[PDB]
Write a protein that binds this DNA or RNA. Structure first.
Lengths: 458, 225, 166, 32, 374
RNA sequence: GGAAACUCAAAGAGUGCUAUGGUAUGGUGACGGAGUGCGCUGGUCAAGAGUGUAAAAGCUUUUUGAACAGAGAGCAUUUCCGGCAGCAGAGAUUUCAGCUGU
């Protein structure tokens, strides 16, 4: 009943800053008993969890972890993971924006010149290779490998599984950043115009057009927790947006200069933003505190990414550098680059790699595996990062081994339980409650000159 | 009994207990009259010479040096005694033994959102009424006359920074609760398959009234009212 | 309440135990009428508790004639006395579902604690177990049921017509 | 708390231990 | 899914089995992933009784490892907590699930019964009674289950009334195999032998006869004859009187061969009145069998029963005092047989001489016996 | 238009498979087993009562009692065991079965 890992499974509630009703008293007592039983029994599943997370540990004081080479990892790990660590050398079209499907089964690469390829990177099956000879910028899958949206010269296009064009969106005028919201079925679009557009993929209907009013959108990320969009502008300002409010939900002053990249944890708690002022900044999202401010990077961080197990992958051109346990509150988790004299209270890099020829275009962790796919000027490279993936997925949220029938039925079922775009709030648990107006107690309709003293009476 | 049926979490509507008859066993006779020719032959022989074993209970209900020396006749009587005889022998040994023993800039946006907050101190105090406004000729004091308070979204000393979907939230607190703390403590745990275990999911979704799908529900009967 | 079910068939006798009653009032409805076609829901109604197979085609023909003219044979007496609980004869008899309204009197003549039902509910329970057959029996019989049906039909017909091979 | 050989044998069965399997694959050296 | 239900039913015993400090978390995760494999193979499609059997073997192996680790770590032989019965209860439930799914392999049913009996004091004999009841319900015609049920409830519990009820119900169901008849006469002889030996023992320390076995012998002959004449000549009686008398002769041969086996394994019960209990089968075989076993064919069987009736007192050892008492009875038997028979006269004479010579200073009294039977 | 297939995908229809938790194992020493007591089932007999009648007989009875036959389908509680040896016994070196005390 005690369960040393309950507070992961606990659930916050409302507080005022007991009752005389017998029936209501016993009803609330049954509700508290059921909540305790449910938390305990849900937290006892960690026995049933099949796999264990990966790691790499130094076992010596001369053996630092950032100086461990990718060939040495590929020798030290098994043949299946060594074959997952792919490398495509696609030289002639531009730097390749990488994208993985939400289970790690499909890869979607876009060249800057025109070359968009959707493929099953772990078999050898490509299912779309289309050369759209205008400058493409980004792409994403929608709810499947079966549809993907590409952001072209101006218009965003939507292609089916084999690459036939389904849609040319006449809105979404100049996208540079696309991201799909999978529980809400919303393709979110931002770019050189100062506008943020939410487009419902299922109905086909443009849900929202929002003026950023801050020029072109330099970075864009999605909170996986509550589906609000963090856009980074040329002010050094991140703004958190929802498709209901025509104003940003929050505006944070992250950096000086512009904001080069944003990444959010999948728990929706931490956000790493890199500015062009050579400054990485780790942010608390829920309480909006600034946790860490790594200033004076040697060159501006062009990308950040956060794995499912909380690694932090920063990329500064040729270099990729990953820190472990950097998204924590304490000042001993501030990511350093060296430990001055061997200080154990300095978060040196967990591992680093140098793409010596080129400058990396973007970063993306492969979802349920221990790999980091970085797309760069001459194609794709996966890196075996051992701490970097949820070993125990849930197979009824999203399954890496899913079949054709399972894809069909899961598509219909998630389409059926698509969440409305109005339910996107800054916290997800605020659509069962009562208003923050409409008084917290329910109402019971019962509650619904001594002369002048004489001259008074006149 | 009406109160415990109102307070019971689950009513399984075969509630009057069905009179369970003795099960159709293969260790006995389900008619108690001889049903085959073999059975009537064996019983007429066995009633010529009965074997209810009261004689074979009294024969083996008879049997220090009885403990140490009699280690052969003890095993002989152990092999000899029948079912109820051995049950009575175990009870006799049990009763005998039991009778024997007992970041500087980050402050400008924070200051601007503090100013877009905090009770919104407007003043339209009186523009010109009564007191010869405009172009010199000052009035008297106490031009306090209108300091009304349009309520801000949160007061200044009740934030934590100091230290389309109002249809997805209910209008007031519903009936059986008295405050929204109680009501949201009801809503705080999801009963879904994805968020509970399988046993907890089943306990959370079984309904209160569980009837059988094709048999008559009789009125309640109590043990002598 | 339709508590037990007696299915006669050429390989032997089967006693099933009714788990869930089907609806009495909604017995003509579309979903109730096609739940006996779906096997995944019929197995929620019917469970096999006993199957006494015959000793051969001779006892098969004897029991086919006894079932045909509505009499309880000795193998019927054996399997019913093994399977049905010793209920009372004056208060809440055990309920057996048959398909033959003139075999019922022969069953109560032998077991007075058994009331027998063959109305439309017992009829479509019986035709559910006829429709599914070999799937309900879980693998416990020798001999394919249709092959025994061919043999028993030919034997019954030649007996009824007195077919002489001289 | 010492070890035991029967305990470690059926523990290698229960926990699914291929340690002796990889030891024999590394050891057998094609000696015939 | 129901594999999820069963797998999270497995968690309190390993809660307790980690708290009692014998297993660790990393090894109990290994036994849970093996048990996950097994539960998924059990309640998915395409299932097998070998999947059930391998799960039972794995659970017994982790039970034996748990007992070994308990004795080595805690130095007790049971922790008297949940984790010493939960795993045997799991094995019993895997058996119950398997016998509900595939109730057709008597190997698995008998493994269930063997494990449930060998569980010892912790099981209940009414729990064994329940699975005997449902197994005998599903297989009423398989006769070794009736023998095993009655053998468990007589040779372990000594419950004569219930054992008689089991044998009478089995003989109600299949009154056609002679094996159940022979085991019933064996049980009745064992019961009457234990009765008279407890009488002898109560005499030595301080009416009801084998006529039960003779009456079930009589109904054994009658119903086995009836079922053989109904089994052969199966569909109809379309057969002329040659084939009818051929059939009736063959059923007499069948039934009399079974009674020959009855006396052959009847002689070794020598603690009751074995002479009376064999002589009553002799007099039950001596009468007419409606197709002239004596006055026509089966004259070899008549000679066999005459030889049995002659040696029925001479069933003795080489100490031949009974022969010196009543060999004149055997001489009068040979004279009464050779007064009528033609070649059976010479056959019975040579056979009685060869039998007495094979069965029987000591050679000088045997020289008197050789001069007698010469 | 055509051809090929241990090619790759997108979908439709039908069929097969015990496809079986009407509220999930016999048991978190909070437990199990044994025994006792209560409870329950069936038939029989006796008594009561009604109804009927000249008397009856018969029939009815959610009325009680008796012995008998049982079911595994319920409920207690400190009656014992799931402690240790010595010893013989049981089955295939492991488990199983009772006496004298802790």
């Amino acid at each position: 009943k005690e369960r040393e890992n309950q507070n992961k499974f606990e659930r916050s509630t409302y507080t005022n800053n007991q009752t005389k009703d017998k029936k209501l008293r016993a009803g609330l007592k049954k509700i508290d008993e059921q909540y305790k039983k449910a938390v305990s029994s849900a937290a006892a599943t960690d026995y049933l969890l099949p796999e264990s997370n990966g790691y790499l540990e130094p076992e010596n004081e001369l053996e630092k972890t950032f100086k461990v080479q990718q060939s040495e990892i590929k020798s030290s790990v098994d043949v299946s993971t060594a074959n997952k660590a792919l490398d495509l050398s696609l030289k002639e079209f531009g730097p390749y924006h990488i994208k993985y499907a939400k289970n790690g089964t499909h890869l979607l690469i876009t060249g800057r010149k025109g070359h968009v390829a959707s493929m099953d990177w772990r078999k050898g099956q490509l299912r779309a290779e289309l050369f759209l000879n205008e400058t493409c910028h980004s792409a994403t899958y929608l709810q499947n490998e079966q549809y993907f949206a590409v952001a072209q010269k101006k218009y965003t296009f939507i292609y089916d599984h084999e690459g036939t064009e389904l849609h040319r969106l006449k809105q979404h005028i100049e996208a540079r950043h696309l991201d799909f919201l999978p529980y809400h079925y919303l393709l979110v679009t931002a770019g050189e115009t100062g506008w943020l557009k939410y487009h419902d993929v299922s109905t086909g209907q443009l849900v929202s057009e929002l003026r950023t009013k801050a020029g072109p959108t330099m970075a864009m990320a999605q909170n996986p927790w509550n589906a609000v969009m963090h856009l980074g502008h040329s002010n050094g300002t991140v703004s958190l947006w929802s498709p209901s409010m025509p104003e940003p939900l929050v505006k944070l002053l992250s950096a000086r200069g512009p904001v080069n990249s944003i990444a959010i944890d999948r728990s929706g708690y931490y956000m790493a933003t890199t500015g062009a002022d050579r400054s990485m900044k780790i942010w608390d999202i829920r309480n909006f505190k600034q946790l860490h401010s790594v200033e004076s990077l040697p060159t501006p961080g062009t990308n950040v990414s956060i794995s499912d197990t909380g690694l932090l992958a920063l990329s500064r051109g040729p270099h990729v550098t990953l820190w472990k346990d950097a998204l924590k509150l304490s000042g001993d988790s501030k990511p350093c680059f060296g430990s001055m004299g061997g200080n154990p209270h300095r978060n040196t890099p967990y591992m680093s790699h140098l793409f010596a020829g080129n400058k990396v275009e973007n970063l993306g962790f492969v979802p349920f595996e221990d790999l980091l796919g970085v797309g760069h000027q001459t194609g794709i490279t996966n890196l075996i990062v051992p701490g970097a993936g949820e070993a125990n997925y849930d197979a009824l949220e999203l399954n890496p081994f899913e079949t054709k029938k399972q894809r069909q039925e899961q598509e219909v079922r998630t389409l059926l339980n698509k969440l409305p775009a109005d339910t996107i709030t800054l916290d997800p648990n605020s659509i069962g409650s009562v208003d923050k107006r409409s008084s917290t107690i329910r109402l019971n309709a019962k509650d619904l000159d001594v002369i002048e003293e004489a001259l008074s009476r006149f | 009994i009406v109160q415990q049926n109102r307070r019971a979490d689950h009513l399984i509507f075969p509630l009057n207990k069905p009179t369970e008859h003795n099960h159709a066993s293969a260790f006995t006779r389900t008619q108690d009259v001889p049903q085959t020719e073999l059975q009537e032959k064996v019983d007429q022989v066995l009633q010529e010479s009965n074997l209810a074993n009261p004689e074979k209970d009294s024969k083996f209900e008879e049997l220090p040096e009885e403990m140490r020396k009699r280690t052969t006749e003890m095993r002989l009587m152990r092999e000899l005694m029948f079912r109820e005889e051995r049950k009575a022998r175990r009870l006799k040994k049990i009763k005998s033994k039991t009778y024997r023993k007992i970041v500087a800039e980050f402050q400008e946006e924070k200051k601007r959102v503090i100013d877009d907050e905090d009770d919104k101190e407007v003043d339209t105090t009186l523009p010109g009424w009564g007191e010869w406004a405009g172009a010199g000729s000052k009035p008297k004091n106490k031009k306090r006359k209108f300091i009304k308070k349009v309520k801000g979204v949160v007061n200044k000393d009740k934030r934590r920074d100091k230290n389309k979907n109002l249809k997805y939230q209910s209008s007031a607190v519903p009936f059986p609760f008295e405050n929204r703390e109680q009501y949201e403590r009801s809503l705080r745990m999801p009963i879904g398959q994805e968020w509970t275990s399988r046993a907890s999911h089943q306990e959370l979704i079984k309904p209160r009234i569980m009837t059988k799908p094709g048999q008559v529900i009789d009125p309640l009967k109590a043990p002598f009212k | 309440p339709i508590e037990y079910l007696l299915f006669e068939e050429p390989t032997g006798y089967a006693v099933f135990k009714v788990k869930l009653q089907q609806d009495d009032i909604g017995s003509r409805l579309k979903e109730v009428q096609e739940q006996i076609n779906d096997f995944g829901a019929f197995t929620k109604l019917i469970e096999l508790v006993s199957f006494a197979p015959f000793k051969g085609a001779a006892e098969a023909l004897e029991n086919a004639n006894d079932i045909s003219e509505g009499l309880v044979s000795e193998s019927l007496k054996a399997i019913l006395d093994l399977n049905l609980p010793k209920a009372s004869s004056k208060k809440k008899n055990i309920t057996l579902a048959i398909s033959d309204k003139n075999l019922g009197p022969s069953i109560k003549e032998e077991f007075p604690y058994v009331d027998c039902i063959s109305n439309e509910l017992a009829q479509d329970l019986i035709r559910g177990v006829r429709l599914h057959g070999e799937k309900l029996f879980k693998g416990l019989q020798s001999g394919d049921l249709e092959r025994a049906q061919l043999g028993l039909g030919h034997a019954y017909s030649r007996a009824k017509v007195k077919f002489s091979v001289q | 708390p010492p070890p035991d050989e029967e305990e470690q044998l059926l523990a290698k069965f229960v926990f699914g231990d291929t340690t002796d399997l990889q030891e024999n694959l590394a050891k057998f050296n094609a000696d015939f | 899914s129901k594999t999820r239900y069963y797998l999270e039913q497995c968690i309190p015993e390993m809660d307790d089995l980690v708290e009692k400090g014998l297993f660790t978390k990393n090894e109990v995760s290994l036994i849970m992933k093996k048990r996950t494999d097994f539960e998924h193979r059990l309640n998915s499609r395409g299932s097998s009784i070998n999947d059930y059997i391998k799960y039972i073997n794995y659970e017994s192996n982790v039970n034996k490892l748990r007992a070994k680790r308990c004795k080595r770590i805690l130095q007790v032989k049971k922790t008297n907590s949940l984790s010493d019965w939960s795993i045997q209860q799991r094995i019993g439930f895997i058996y119950q699930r398997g016998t509900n799914k595939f109730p057709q392999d008597l190997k698995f049913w008998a493994m269930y019964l063997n494990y449930m009996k060998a569980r010892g004091n912790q099981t209940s004999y009414k729990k064994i009674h329940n699975i005997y009841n449902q197994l005998l319900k599903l297989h009423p015609t398989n006769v070794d289950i009736w023998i095993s049920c009655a053998k468990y409830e007589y040779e372990v519990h000594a419950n004569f009334k219930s054992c008689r009820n089991i044998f009478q119900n089995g003989l109600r169901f299949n009154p056609d195999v002679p094996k159940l008849w022979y085991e019933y006469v064996k049980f009745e002889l064992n019961f009457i032998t234990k009765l008279i030996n407890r009488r002898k023992v109560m005499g030595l320390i301080n009416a009801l006869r084998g006529d039960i076995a003779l009456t079930i012998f009589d109904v054994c002959m009658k119903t086995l004859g009836k079922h053989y004449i109904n089994k052969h000549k199966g569909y109809y009686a379309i057969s002329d009187s040659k084939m009818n008398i051929e059939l009736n002769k063959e059923t007499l041969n069948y039934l009399f061969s079974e009674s020959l086996r009855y006396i052959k394994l009847f002689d070794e019960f020598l603690d009751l009145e074995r002479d009376y209990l064999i002589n009553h089968v002799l007099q039950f075989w001596k009468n007419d069998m409606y197709d002239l076993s004596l006055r026509k064919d089966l004259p070899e069987l008549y000679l066999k029963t005459v030889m049995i009736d002659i040696t029925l007192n001479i069933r003795y050892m080489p100490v031949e005092k009974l022969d010196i008492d009543q060999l004149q009875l055997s001489v009068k038997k040979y004279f009464a047989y050779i007064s009528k028979l033609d070649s059976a006269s010479v056959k019975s004479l040579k056979n009685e001489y060869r039998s007495y010579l094979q069965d029987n200073a000591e050679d000088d009294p045997r020289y008197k016996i050789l001069d007698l039977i010469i």
